[PDB]
Amino acid sequence: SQPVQLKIASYGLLKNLTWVSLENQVPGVGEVKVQIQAVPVNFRDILNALGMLQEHNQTKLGITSVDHLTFGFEAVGVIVGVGLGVSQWQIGDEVMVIGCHDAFSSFIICSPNNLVAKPANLKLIEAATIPIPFFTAYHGLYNLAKIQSGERVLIHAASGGTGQAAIQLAQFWGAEVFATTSPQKMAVLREQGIKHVMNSRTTEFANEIRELTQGKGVDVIFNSLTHGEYIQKNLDVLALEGRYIEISKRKIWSHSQVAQKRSDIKYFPFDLLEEFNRDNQLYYQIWKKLIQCFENKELHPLVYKTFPNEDIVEAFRYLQRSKHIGRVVVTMP
């Protein structure tokens, strides 16, 4: 059809998602225009559609009203315009886009610092599964937690995109992986070679890990569940001087609050987009290492299901339900 951008007419219902006309934009100094070909849905997109991040988005981002909210944090596509002062990108170049906020658009304008090259051995669509999960998992496990061979790591929500990336990375580095997921998905995790798999929908994992480790706990926790009593349960299973990586957005504890309960542990709450704001070379730097792993087949793209963009509402619901392991990738016309 015509150039479009995904919007939500008002907060609270996924059926309110609408493709609206997208006016043409020219890239300015230090900007590139990218024609989008495929975009994964992220859970943050669903929370935003539901209006569950209104406080967060108002303060840190420009978002005062639903009419300034856009969707999509990563994509794959082709460079179609190059602004003044941009070198080493050319029209026609295939790129992965990481860390935008409007990927669900026919075209986006962004910094070259948000672009990385596709591993040439992968199909474009496969490559779309990589950016948010692997950059988030690498940043948390390596840049922050500094995970070592032989250490025990608990990866929560391990069937989701980021959790799946974190399994691949932790296993590559030779950590002992403990995982939580929904009971229905435990069987698939087991066959990825995970020895210890537990229920993500109760706090029963605390006692189970205590028993499994005979009171020693785990060295690293990679968490995305904070609702209710999960944060405190995580603190209870963390080994002495362990590292707690927190990527949840709603209701997280401060460093001081964490220190009140466990003064010995390192605490890493983070948002990948804020970390890029601190260091605009973050994606370039991570990808310098990661692209080689994907080229050597040491890491691999994630399971996915595709949907055409006209089926955007069903694509969102399909991820919200997550009956099976798999990212949801939407193709653009």
Side-chain angles (χ1 to χ4, degrees):
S1 187
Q2 282 275 113
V4 285
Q5 170 169 81
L6 189 67
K7 297 295 276 189
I8 192 162
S10 56
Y11 293 118
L13 296 160
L14 303 179
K15 76 163 185 78
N16 288 343
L17 290 166
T18 318
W19 291 102
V20 310
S21 182
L22 175 65
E23 83 217 337
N24 188 48
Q25 297 290 346
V26 176
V29 166
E31 301 179 320
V32 174
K33 185 172 168 197
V34 180
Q35 183 169 356
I36 301 299
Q37 300 179 322
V39 189
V41 184
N42 280 285
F43 290 104
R44 189 167 166 171
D45 289 312
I46 292 162
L47 297 159
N48 279 335
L50 298 184
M52 301 167 72
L53 284 165
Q54 283 182 78
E55 199 178 40
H56 177 275
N57 295 333
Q58 187 176 255
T59 53
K60 304 165 163 295
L61 304 161
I63 315 155
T64 323
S65 91
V66 78
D67 300 296
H68 296 114
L69 179 65
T70 57
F71 297 91
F73 297 93
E74 57 182 323
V76 65
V78 46
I79 295 184
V80 288
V82 171
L84 270 44
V86 179
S87 76
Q88 274 216 291
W89 291 114
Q90 287 189 314
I91 293 180
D93 287 350
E94 302 196 310
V95 288
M96 301 162 287
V97 181
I98 174 60
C100 53
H101 204 313
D102 54 357
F104 281 112
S105 294
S106 305
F107 304 88
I108 60 168
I109 302 301
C110 64
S111 170
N113 291 329
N114 294 95
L115 303 183
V116 298
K118 196 195 66 177
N121 58 312
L122 297 182
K123 294 176 135 45
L124 167 124
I125 204 93
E126 290 184 298
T129 70
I130 299 166
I132 292 300
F134 282 90
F135 283 70
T136 306
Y138 187 97
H139 189 61
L141 291 170
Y142 177 72
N143 283 156
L144 301 182
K146 288 266 139 32
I147 194 160
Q148 297 300 310
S149 192
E151 301 189 303
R152 291 187 262 252
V153 56
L154 174 62
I155 295 169
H156 279 304
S159 292
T162 300
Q164 285 281 285
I167 290 156
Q168 284 197 43
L169 292 173
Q171 285 185 325
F172 171 81
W173 286 319
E176 190 190 354
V177 175
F178 297 67
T180 65
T181 184
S182 206
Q184 285 279 302
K185 292 182 268 191
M186 294 177 179
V188 164
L189 285 202
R190 287 182 209 287
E191 69 160 54
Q192 301 190 343
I194 298 165
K195 302 169 182 184
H196 320 282
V197 186
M198 294 158 273
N199 187 355
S200 61
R201 298 179 184 280
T202 80
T203 51
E204 175 70 14
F205 64 90
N207 304 321
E208 296 181 314
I209 287 159
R210 179 176 301 123
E211 297 180 311
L212 277 168
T213 68
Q214 305 161 308
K216 301 157 203 167
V218 296
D219 305 303
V220 177
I221 290 160
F222 190 95
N223 183 44
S224 57
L225 6 145
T226 59
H227 25 96
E229 203 76 357
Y230 292 69
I231 294 177
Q232 174 65 60
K233 289 302 183 185
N234 288 337
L235 295 169
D236 293 347
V237 290
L238 210 25
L240 278 164
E241 319 202 316
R243 293 93 86 192
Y244 182 38
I245 309 160
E246 181 65 275
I247 61 153
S248 166
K249 310 209 63 53
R250 303 156 295 161
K251 177 207 166 177
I252 52 101
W253 290 18
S254 71
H255 286 80
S256 73
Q257 287 175 326
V258 166
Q260 287 176 238
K261 305 306 162 203
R262 286 286 303 272
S263 54
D264 60 300
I265 70 161
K266 305 192 262 303
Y267 180 48
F268 294 105
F270 82 93
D271 177 284
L272 185 68
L273 272 68
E274 303 190 340
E275 294 287 77
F276 172 87
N277 291 342
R278 303 185 165 92
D279 180 351
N280 297 170
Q281 292 292 316
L282 183 59
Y283 310 138
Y284 177 82
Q285 289 160 358
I286 293 178
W287 194 242
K288 267 193 57 180
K289 190 52 171 56
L290 293 191
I291 198 178
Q292 306 187 255
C293 311
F294 285 101
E295 293 170 349
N296 293 321
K297 291 169 160 62
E298 295 169 307
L299 296 173
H300 68 74
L302 305 177
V303 178
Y304 69 92
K305 179 171 198 315
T306 65
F307 283 90
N309 82 311
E310 59 269 31
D311 297 341
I312 193 59
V313 170
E314 296 317 302
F316 274 53
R317 304 186 171 140
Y318 191 89
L319 184 65
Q320 186 184 46
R321 294 205 210 87
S322 286
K323 194 209 186 162
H324 312 291
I325 302 80
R327 301 212 75 198
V328 170
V329 181
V330 178
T331 53
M332 297 292 291

